[PDB]
A paper describes a structure:
We recently discovered the cattleyene synthase (CyS) from Streptomyces cattleya and studied its cyclization mechanism through isotopic labelings. Some polycyclic diterpenoids have attracted increasing attention, e.g. gibberellins are phytohormones derived from ent‐kaurene, while phorbol esters exhibiting the tigliane skeleton are currently in phase II clinical trials for the treatment of acute myeloid leukemia. Their biosynthesis is attributed to diterpene synthases (DTSs), the type I of which catalyzes the conversion of GGPP through diphosphate abstraction and cationic cascade reactions. Substrate ionization is mediated by a Lewis acidic trinuclear Mg2+ cluster, bound itself to a highly conserved Asp‐rich motif (DDXX(X)D) and an NSE/DTE triad ((N,D)DLX(S,T)XXXE), to which the substrate's pyrophosphate docks, with assistance of a highly conserved Arg residue (pyrophosphate sensor). Here we report on the crystal structures of apo‐CyS, CyS complexed with GGPP and Mg2+ (CyS‐GGPP‐Mg2+), and the CySC59A enzyme variant.
Author numbering: 12 to 363
Write the structure that this text describes.
């Protein structure tokens, strides 16, 4: 039971999810991943078309397919190449693969395949399709968003190998990157087909809006995937992972699980309010591509929640247990009473 979330933003579904699902399943099947039926079922439970369709419900299907296909292969990357394989040489293996992915995005004919490689062929295909539509700056943004994601995953793998729990001030600014927030959303302006001006994207107010949105969505992800984490921990007989806002607040405040859930939701509510309030100040002078970017972030927050609460990824985790985890949520219609910055110095500047 997730305490009431404040997110007064409308959500909508793309009308062509079935087509996007079919094409993305056909697309990923065309490479050399040797997907088992269990793996194909898990990808269905991921519902990539439902996810990105909620971010861009009005976009043309053939263009949105590019972002859906990226989600498809990167969910597989997460499940198969992040914190997997032999413990010996795990960090080195990840850094090796991660840098090849980034290079293929920059140089699709780099020919970096190794013995048994599977990931680079679809990545190359995404980069080649992206380059038909994207400006050079947009392609650069994709590569750098992937670097920020992958450096954060290397950070995260260190905590998982130590089974340690990050301090809140560290998690609070890193979580947007372990969630690949920017790498997920970089595809949007390519789908839209117009470059967001660098001076806008780089301005402090837009940087704040960007980090606010990606952090809120990732914390929401921590909340609607918490049940699956407790499921895994119970199956494997271990404590839940410390890589999650709920467990971080539980450890930091020496509180119960219900109290930590309330504190996590309270933080999400304050970030969401700040995003909305800062949005109102930025929109008057925003260019049309910036306005579209902020529209995508506005659909991301409620769309991410609806997707995460209803996708089988966080309800039937292994793909063989319908209803193993059921997460419920509420909508708080009242804004947070406290609109001041939280005592988290790594993110406090969002309230500047």
């Amino acid at each position: 039971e997730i305490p009431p979330r404040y997110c007064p933003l409308p959500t909508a579904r793309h009308p062509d999810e079935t087509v996007l699902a079919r094409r993305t399943a056909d697309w990923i099947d065309g490479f050399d991943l040797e997907l088992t039926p269990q793996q194909r079922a898990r990808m269905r439970g991921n519902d990539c078309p439902g996810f990105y369709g909620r971010i861009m419900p009005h976009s043309p299907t053939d263009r949105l397919q590019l972002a859906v296909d990226w989600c498809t292969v990167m969910f597989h990357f997460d499940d198969v190449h992040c914190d997997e394989g032999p413990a010996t040489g795990r960090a080195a293996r990840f850094a090796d693969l991660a840098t090849r992915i980034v290079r293929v995005l920059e140089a699709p004919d780099a020919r970096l395949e190794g013995p048994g490689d599977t990931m680079l062929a679809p990545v190359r295909d995404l980069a080649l399709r992206a380059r038909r539509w994207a400006t050079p700056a947009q392609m650069r943004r994709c590569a750098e968003a992937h670097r920020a994601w992958f450096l954060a995953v290397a950070w995260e793998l260190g905590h998982r190998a130590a089974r340690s729990t990050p301090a809140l001030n560290d998690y609070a600014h890193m979580r947007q990157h372990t969630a690949a927030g920017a790498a997920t959303l970089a595809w949007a302006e390519i789908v839209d087909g117009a470059e967001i001006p660098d001076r806008e994207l780089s301005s402090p107010e837009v940087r704040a809006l960007t980090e606010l949105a990606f952090t809120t969505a990732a914390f929401d992800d921590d909340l609607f995937s918490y049940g699956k984490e407790l499921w895994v921990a119970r199956a494997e007989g271990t404590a839940p992972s410390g890589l999650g806002l709920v467990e971080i607040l539980r450890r930091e405040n020496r509180c119960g699980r219900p109290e930590a859930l309330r504190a996590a939701v309270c933080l999400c509510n304050r970030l969401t309010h700040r995003f909305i309030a800062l949005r109102e100040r930025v929109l008057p002078d925003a260019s049309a591509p910036l306005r579209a970017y902020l529209d995508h972030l506005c659909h991301l927050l409620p769309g991410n929640l609806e997707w995460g609460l209803t996708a089988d990824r966080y309800r039937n985790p292994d793909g063989r247990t319908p209803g193993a985890v059921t997460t419920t949520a509420s909508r708080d219609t009242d804004p947070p009473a406290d609109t001041s910055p939280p005592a988290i110095p790594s993110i406090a500047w969002w309230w500047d």
